[PDB]
Amino acid sequence: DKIRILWVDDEIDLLKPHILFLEKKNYEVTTSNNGLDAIALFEEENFDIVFLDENMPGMSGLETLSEMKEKKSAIPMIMITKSEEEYIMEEAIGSKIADYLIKPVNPNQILLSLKKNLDDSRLITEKTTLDYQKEFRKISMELAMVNSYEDWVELYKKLLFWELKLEDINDQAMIEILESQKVEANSQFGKYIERNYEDWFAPKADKPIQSHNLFKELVVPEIKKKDKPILFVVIDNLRYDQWKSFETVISNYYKLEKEVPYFSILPTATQYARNAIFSGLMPLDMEKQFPQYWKNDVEDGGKNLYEAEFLSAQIKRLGLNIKEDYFKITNYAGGKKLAENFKALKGNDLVTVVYNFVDMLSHAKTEMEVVKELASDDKAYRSLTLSWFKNSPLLEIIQQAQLLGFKLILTTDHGTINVKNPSKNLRYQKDVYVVKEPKTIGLPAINFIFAKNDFFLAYVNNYNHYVSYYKNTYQHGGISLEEMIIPFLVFNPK
């Protein structure tokens, strides 16, 4: 199949050099000297691409383009014209032209435009596969050398970068190399975390920023600037890769000012960690200082329901005085509502939204066949997350906040990981990091265990049932890059 071009120009006879040039390159050119005839051909026959002049005696190129797009939407159209006027440029681009070449045109420019517009997917696939072939041994080397938390953050960035670059490619060998680097990364990370995690809670220890330090050290400073109100959005259970999947959408409305990967405390679960975000305290200290608010595992009723109170208390412990409002969205109507009425809180200095939809979505894969098919692989989950965010009540809230000139601070409590391997909440033996003293961590317990790598805890009784139902499900609470290294972002409104 030679690629079939329809070329429409009143002065087509003058373009025979260009046509000859293209035909020699296995391009088939049908020509036409008016838009009406071209539309007729464009309907009868199936062309791969159309070239259009702007100024023609009858219908203009842009008019011809309109009639053509109505009839067969997804055929790429290129404009080749003398018009150098900005307003025609703008009308072409506004019409979703694929490219606009000003005459007299270098014939190779046209060829470049054919390659870019018809071949770019496979070319990008080729170049990306070869780029990774040349890069991946450096990545194995770098991983071996990491022994710092600052260095763990860098390496995760690299893996995330290449994850999205390769997500499209179809070369099994290189896909598996990347999987194996990601597995090895977690195995190394788990050893790292168990080796220095306890040491981190000792006085004078060089330490990553964690859950219990988050509000104190990264939120307070941006408030005390005192230029603009701050919208704080804690999106529950958001992996770094999911942030990355919708970074371009959000950037239409917000410009990233500051980005800081941080380390969520163990366990990587809402009640233990999200409460810590709002309290400025480790679990143990929340039990000590607020026994009427803190809830222990064995307690029924549900968790994370006094975050507002934890937060208000922290603000005064710091000594800061501000107007503060806190909300927790747990369903559609909820978030839809808070979008329509976001107006009212302008005068409020800080606004805090907790959004639980992504956790609900991650957990839904466990039970619903539908979600299994929507989130079969990580790529699919990132894709689905993007479909979500683009049409979320959460984006509406974000869109309102910019119109009010709020600075946005966007973060999460922890991520989630696809669990693959059983070991006898499903993440909290070399398979586990034991802490037979809890105060050493700052965890409460009378008189904690954290799964590493891909592991999920399956009880000896009903071991098979646990294995078969929870295999290849998103769980959290343990130690993985995906769970524990999580974004903290400040943005300025556009």
Give the residue ranges of the annotated binding site for Mg(2+).
9-11, 53, 55
Instruction: Name which of a copy of itself, Zn ion, none residue 413 binds, using a CB cut-off of 5 to 8 Å depending on partner kind.
Output: Zn ion
Per-residue DSSP letter, 403: H
- DSSP E strand boundaries for 358-482: 407-411, 417-419, 421-423, 432-434, 449-451, 455-457, 473-475
121 binds a copy of itself (CB under 8 A): yes
- Which of 407/427 has CB closer to Zn ion? 427
Which of positions 364-383 make contact with a copy of itself (CB under 8 A)? 364, 368-374, 376-377, 379-380, 383
* Rounded CA separation 129/133 (Å): 6
- Which of 257/325 has CB closer to a copy of itself? 257
Binds a copy of itself (CB under 8 A): choice among 386, 404, 445, 449: 386
- Which of 64/237 has CB closer to Zn ion? 237
46 binds a copy of itself (CB under 8 A): yes
341 binds a copy of itself (CB under 8 A): no
Among the listed residues 126, 166, 133, 158, the one whose alpha carbon sits nearest the alpha carbon of residue 379: 166
84 binds a copy of itself (CB under 8 A): yes
Which of positions 155-194 make contact with a copy of itself (CB under 8 A)? 157-158, 161
- Which of 108/321 has CB closer to a copy of itself? 108
Least distance between a copy of itself and beta carbon 70 (Å): 6
Helix (H, G, I), strand (E, B) or coil at 427: coil
Residues after which a C–N gap over 2.5 Å breaks the chain: 424, 428, 447
The first and second tokens of residue 50, run together, are 């159309």
131 binds a copy of itself (CB under 8 A): yes
- Which of 223/361 has CB closer to a copy of itself? 361
Measured between alpha carbons, how far is residue 290 from residues 201, 293, 295, 307 in Å? 21, 5, 10, 12
112 binds a copy of itself (CB under 8 A): yes
Annotated binding site for Zn(2+): 10-11, 53, 55, 236, 270, 359, 363, 413-414, 476
Binds a copy of itself (CB under 8 A): choice among 111, 153, 169, 175: 111
2 binds a copy of itself (CB under 8 A): no
387 binds a copy of itself (CB under 8 A): yes
Q: Is the dihedral of CA 440, 443, 448, 450 positive or negative?
A: negative
Q: Which stretch binds Zn ion (CB under 5 A): 5-13, 132-140, 286-294, 444-452?
A: 5-13
- The dihedral region occupied by 487, where left means phi > 0, alpha psi between -120 and 50, and beta the remainder, is beta
Least distance between Zn ion and beta carbon 460 (Å): 24
Annotated binding site: 9-11, 53, 55, 91, 236-237, 270, 359, 363, 413-414, 436, 476
Cβ distance 219 to 260 under 8 Å?
Answer: no
Binds Zn ion (CB under 5 A): choice among 181, 270, 271, 304: 270
* Rounded CA separation 342/345 (Å): 6
Which of positions 224-243 make contact with Zn ion (CB under 5 A)? 236-237
Cβ distance 487 to 414 under 8 Å?
Answer: no
- What is the residue whose two structure tokens read 């222990």? 296
348 binds Zn ion (CB under 5 A): no
> Quick one: which H or E segment has residue 263?
strand 254-263
Least distance between Zn ion and beta carbon 139 (Å): 30
At 175, give phi and psi (nearest 5°). -55, -45
Which of positions 222-261 make contact with a copy of itself (CB under 8 A)? 244, 247-248, 251-252, 255-257
The 3-state secondary structure of 179-242 reads HHHHHHHHHHHHHHHHHHHHHHCCCCCCCCCEHHHHHHHHHHHHHCCCCCCEEEEEECCCCHHH
31 binds Zn ion (CB under 5 A): no
